[PDB]
Amino acid sequence: ALRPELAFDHDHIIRCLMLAAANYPRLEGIIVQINTGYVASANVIRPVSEKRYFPENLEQNQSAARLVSAVKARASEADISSIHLAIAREVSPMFNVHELKKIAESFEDPSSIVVVLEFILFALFFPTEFNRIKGDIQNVLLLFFSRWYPVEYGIFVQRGATYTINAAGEFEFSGRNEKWDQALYLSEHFPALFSDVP
Amino acid sequence: PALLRDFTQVNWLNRDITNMLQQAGTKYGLGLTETRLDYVRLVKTIVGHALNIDHFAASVLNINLRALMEANVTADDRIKALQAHSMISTQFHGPNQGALRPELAFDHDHIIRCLMLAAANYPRLEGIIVQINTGYVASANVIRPVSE
Amino acid sequence: ISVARSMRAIVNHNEVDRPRGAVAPSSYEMDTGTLSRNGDLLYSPVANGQVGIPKLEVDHISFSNVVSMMTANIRTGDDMAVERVNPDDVRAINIRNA
Amino acid sequence: KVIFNGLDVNTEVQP
Amino acid sequence: IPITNSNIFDDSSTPYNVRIWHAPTMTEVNHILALMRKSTLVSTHSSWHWNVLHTFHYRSESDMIDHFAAKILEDWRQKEKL
Amino acid sequence: MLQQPTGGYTTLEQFAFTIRNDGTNATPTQFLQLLSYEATENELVKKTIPTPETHLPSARNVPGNVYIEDAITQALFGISAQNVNAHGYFSRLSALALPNTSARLGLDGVIYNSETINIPFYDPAAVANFAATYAKLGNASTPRYRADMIDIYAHVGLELAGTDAERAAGVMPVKRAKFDSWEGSLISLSRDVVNWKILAFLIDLCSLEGEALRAFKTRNRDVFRMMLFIMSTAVAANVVNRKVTKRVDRVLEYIGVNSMRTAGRTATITYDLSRHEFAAKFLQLTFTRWNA
Amino acid sequence: NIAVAHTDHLSVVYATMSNFMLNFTNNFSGNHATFKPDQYVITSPEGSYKPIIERQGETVDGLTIIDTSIVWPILCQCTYPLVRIMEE
Amino acid sequence: ITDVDSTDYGKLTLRFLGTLTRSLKMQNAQIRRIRPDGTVLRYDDQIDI
Amino acid sequence: ITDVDSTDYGKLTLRFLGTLTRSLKMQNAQIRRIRPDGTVLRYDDQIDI
Fold this sequence. Notes:
The structure is cut from a larger assembly and holds seven copies of chain A, one copy of chain E (82 residues) and one copy of chain F (292 residues).
Chain A: H1 10-23, H2 26-42, H3 65-74, H4 80-88, E1 99-100, H5 113-125, H6 127-148, H7 150-159, E2 162-165, E3 171-173, E4 190-191
Antiparallel strand pairs in A: 2-3, 2-4
Chain E: E1 16-20, H1 26-36, E2 42-44, E3 54-58, H2 61-81
Antiparallel strand pairs in E: 1-3, 2-3
Chain F: E1 19-21, E2 24-26, H1 28-32, E3 36-38, E4 43-45, E5 66-67, H2 68-77, H3 93-97, E6 104-105, E7 110-112, H4 124-134, H5 152-160, H6 164-169, E8 171-173, E9 176-180, H7 185-194, H8 198-207, H9 210-219, H10 221-235, E10 238-243, E11 248-253, H11 273-290
Antiparallel strand pairs in F: 1-2, 3-9, 4-8, 5-7, 6-7, 9-11, 10-11
Helix pairs in contact in F: 2-7, 4-8, 5-10, 5-11, 7-10
Protein name (chain B): Inner capsid protein VP1
Subcellular location (chain B): Virion
Subunit structure (chain B): Homodecamer; each decamer is made up of two conformers of VP2, called VP2A and VP2B. 12 homodecamers assemble to form an icosahedral capsid.
């Protein structure tokens, strides 16, 4: 059945989208809003009032207070906009390189393990956005490794904190320790923690 | 005077100025001229401008700007000072402004020379420095009076 | 006495092409020159393959010069926001090791 | 506490 | 690392203290020494134990003088049989 | 694209290096003629220079056209450069290093990420030869790759003050340089040198081979020496003047000795420690190329 | 408790949004070890150079910075249509 | 003239540096994959669409 | 001539510093360590900054 309208120009629209992405900052957000809105229309998640962060009694337990203070330090209140966005952004195109909101964690207390888990969850619930901010995560996890597994840490960092990938596909580690910056997200270098090379 | 060319009615003057401006050895201009974008933001930063001005004041202004730009010290470096005045192992974050916010390097040498001179000329300066530290300890809330 | 005389008799004469003793402005008054990479000012080169004479190297006055200046994008001396984050526990803090 | 996608600045350094 | 007197009955102030450096490439050492010229009462051996660069730092010039002396004497006693 | 002659780009009158002196654009060789020396009891023996590191620093992803010549020249002879290792833009040279890169090195000394209209540029093969080494200026800061900043200056002195006999010998007395001097002679010299198009001299140094290269080393030895002179004033432990019957002899002491001084002085340009590392690296790479 | 909601519902929503017309970039290959985004720039001999992805830092759009702690409300104070007992 | 909201176009809108307009002049421009080094590669049919 | 009002804490430090009598003779003045014995030492690289 012949709809009397011009064919949707895939070529012209991908070109104009590339142009917009080069020139119109709002475009990212524009597209994101659509996805955010779609997530909202699907009714996939809603924020309930009752937090379930702790086992019964452990919150009121006196020796648990450090851990509980820590989990309270990481447990942001549920907000539909923030969640819908967090989910929607997993698929939306990214034009300005994303940065991890930085976390200051010395990893002294065992409860500091919370932060590690906070990343693991982020790695699972949102693998893509994770791939974007992963080196900026690696800067935190390296403090955690040097503080929790110092010898293994020394070997790993001796191999190098980063690597490239030659034409063969073999990884090539720097041999050097250096703090990662998202300036590196757009370069040959990769955070070494996710090399998954034994 | 180069602007009088083909505008002054005094013909000998215009003839002379035209002869000078047509010499290979001299060329009048009005800026803007030189332009320098940031390596990342791609926006313009420093720019030349051939002003009508005495060469001396232009030399001095150029010296000032050269000082400020060649230092390679952005505002981010201030964090290093804030660390010195913060409890050990506080961390500061952001916002990574970069080259767009140049600032002079702290003049450690001049300041230390001046400090020596000041302590020598104003021994009471001791009392000011102490006073600063005193207030800081008060802010640290590390010890309080009690009636008991 | 007139050691500061840039110009004299900016006026026409009927009988003669220029009034006697009229003083034209110096060529250096008008050579806008260039900013050397070092930031010293230079007069325009007198010939190809020659660098320009610096304006301070000589005693002539030059009334066009190339002043570099920052644009609205570069800003200096503005105050700067940061997120301080205190140590979690004052007793865990590492006073000692270098 | 509340989620905030951006720097949560407090201190203001002087030049 | 502070150093104790080899005699262990002398509970008295240590002459100096050793400072093990990160090194490990020779070039890092060239840098650490070139930088070390800017310090105050500091000295190094021509070669270091465990192949890790370390520099003695002296509390006072006299302690330095006594150390340099004992070591000049060691180098002489060694050279004498070399 | 400017083609490279059978000689270097230096053969072109457009790239000629000269310092202003006694009211004219003097060639560097006729400045170095003014130079005289005072040997002291101290001696300088040149050790072998360690080979430059194999590893080329990655250029980062940098959208802009980095101004590499102004960066290098101000880093070495600049009157007020500081923190030269902080921005790390020298690594950008590595972008040029690849075969068939889309980047070009402008005669302006800017590294464009792609060829652009009405901007003349050095022949990319030659520039690849030059970048293939000099990108290593990129690692002057990184600890595993730092140059020696003491021993290398011996070579500087040898190539400056050294007589043909002392030069063949590989040892010279630690000479103290001096010359009849105008007011501010060293600063003005340093600024004449900062405007030098040194990329031309380095490209010819890294790309020319055989007889053309040897003829280049003979033709440009005084230019090299001039840069070495500015650097040596940067490292000189002191720079006094001497009254001498209605004349003033500038004197720098001593050639071939790096005092590692960082506190500034009005007499000469001063190296922040980063500038010391950069200069040491530059000397390592340049002397390495200069002796082959 | 919530895993059936994420796997058996939210994943389908991802699968559909994966096809929406304006999700034009490829974002992640599922391999953290190797993946880099493909990188295009508008560019002209006349000197223009606009990267499509670039790192200008935190911006007013409010999307440049990620608070990972968003995971916590998701794992705790958030109900789902699949938990719980019926819900259309 | 054509009723488009052209606002904040060609303009970075950084949180801290503010708005920064860039040039809109891109005469004869092309969409092109670049090496991570930031330099451009000739349009390959093998990868680019 | 060149007097200019300072930031208020700077005015406080100036007032607390006391009268600027400046009895010091500063012609070619330097900054040198003296020996406890009282002789003024020459500048020493390796000790003085």
